[PDB]
């Protein structure tokens, strides 16, 4: 099984990249029970630039063809208690995202769940032994609510909703 992301327009097969990290936003307020919630980033291009882990490809939510980590995935933030400060994730094993050309890009479901569990484990280090929950983007302009990226004189908009819908105890 794979995870399908609807894109617009249809990215050609040569726009397939490697997910080398992502950018997150922690949901605030009085949390309930044993859960901490994370979504795609609610910031602008400032939050993506603060990472300095991306390559030549401009991209939101997911970093494509960027910098990998040495051994394990590693996360940074200016302030872990400020939810207005985004959480930068740098993977150690890149996830292949391959587009068919008919409007759907695909991602291995098992390898994505594999990296999400590594992310959730590293997030429990910064917020205690809690349940990690990933949820879709809260909203924003089409450039930031979708996984947007440029590829050879183009700019695509891919809904990343199916990527953020898991729970980790």
């Amino acid at each position: 099984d794979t995870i399908t992301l609807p894109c617009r327009p249809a990215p050609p097969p040569h726009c397939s990249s490697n997910i080398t990290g992502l950018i997150l936003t922690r949901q605030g307020g009085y949390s309930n029970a044993n859960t901490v919630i994370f979504r795609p980033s609610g910031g602008d291009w400032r939050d993506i630039a603060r990472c300095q882990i991306a390559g030549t490809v401009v991209s939101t939510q997911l970093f494509l063809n960027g910098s990998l980590a040495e051994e394990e995935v590693v996360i940074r933030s200016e302030n872990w208690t400020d939810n207005a400060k985004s959480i930068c994730v740098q993977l150690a094993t890149s996830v292949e995202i391959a587009c068919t050309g008919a409007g759907h890009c695909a991602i291995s479901r098992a390898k994505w769940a594999n990296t999400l569990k590594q992310i959730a484990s590293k997030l429990r280090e910064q917020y205690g032994a809690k349940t990690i929950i990933f949820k879709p983007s809260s909203g924003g302009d089409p450039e930031f609510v979708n996984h947007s990226f440029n590829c050879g004189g183009e700019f695509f908009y891919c809904a990343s909703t199916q990527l953020f819908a898991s729970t980790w105890f």
Epitope: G43, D82, F144
Partner: antibody, heavy 121, light 103 residues
Framework: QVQSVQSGAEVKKPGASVKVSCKAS????????MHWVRQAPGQGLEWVGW????????NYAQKFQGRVTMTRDTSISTAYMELSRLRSDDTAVYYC??????????????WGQGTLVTVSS | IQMTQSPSSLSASVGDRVTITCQAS??????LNWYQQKPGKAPKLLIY???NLETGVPSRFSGSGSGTDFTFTISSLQPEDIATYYC?????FGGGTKVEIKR
């Protein structure tokens, strides 16, 4: 005088929705996050969420996750909050406030005058 | 974060030394803000980062503390200082302390 002006007081039936405006007078949004804080008639302050004016991204409190929506209009420097499926518990004064995007902490400044929203059938 | 601000209310005469305490349950370092809300108006920032004073606020207002215990003090109460005071740290506010007049 630089200040944040809000829309007038509103009354809504239970189950309806209310949209509150917060217009920037004398400044623009590009350097700040806009936060919304509500206060029930005799209660304390409760944070609802913030919005990024450059991207439209938001981060609502988990209490209002499914029912609140924040937007902004950059051409007129006005932030909006619309609360859906209103209930009697939502009767409160809703404030908007400015928080610097580049700041290390949250320093609520330039509050609006407040907007009284009453839920009643 | 749990914000315990005590007392809930207090009464003092004109000229007495008012002291309001806000204690958090977790180590928040020196960052803690104090707001003053007069009835019918919006909150107004008086003290930021526990001890620093926002521009335009009279010198009678002061604050101290670090870690988890913080105090907010009014050296000489004035007829324009009767209000409800809140401690704030990120999205979490204290319960509030209303200042009343003693007779």
């Amino acid at each position: 005088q630089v200040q944040s002006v809000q829309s007038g007081a509103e009354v809504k039936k239970p189950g309806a929705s209310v949209k509150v405006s917060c217009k920037a007078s004398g400044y623009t949004f590009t350097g700040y996050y806009m936060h919304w804080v509500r206060q029930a008639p005799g209660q304390g302050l409760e944070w609802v969420g913030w919005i990024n004016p450059n991207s439209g991204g938001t981060n609502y409190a988990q209490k209002f996750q499914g029912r609140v929506t924040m937007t902004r209009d950059t051409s007129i420097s006005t932030a909006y909050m619309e609360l859906s499926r209103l209930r009697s518990d939502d009767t409160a004064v809703y404030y908007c406030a400015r928080v610097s995007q580049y700041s290390s902490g949250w320093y609520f400044g330039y509050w609006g005058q407040g907007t009284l929203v009453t839920v009643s059938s | 974060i749990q914000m315990t601000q005590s007392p809930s209310s207090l009464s003092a005469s004109v000229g007495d030394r008012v002291t309001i305490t806000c204690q958090a349950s977790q180590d928040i370092n020196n960052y803690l803000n104090w707001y003053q809300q007069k009835p019918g108006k919006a909150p107004k920032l008086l003290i930021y980062d526990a001890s620093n004073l926002e521009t335009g606020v009279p010198s009678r207002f002061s604050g101290s503390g670090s870690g988890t215990d913080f105090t907010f003090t009014i050296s000489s109460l004035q007829p324009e200082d009767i209000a409800t005071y809140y401690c704030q740290q990120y999205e979490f506010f204290g319960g509030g302390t209303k200042v009343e007049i003693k007779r």
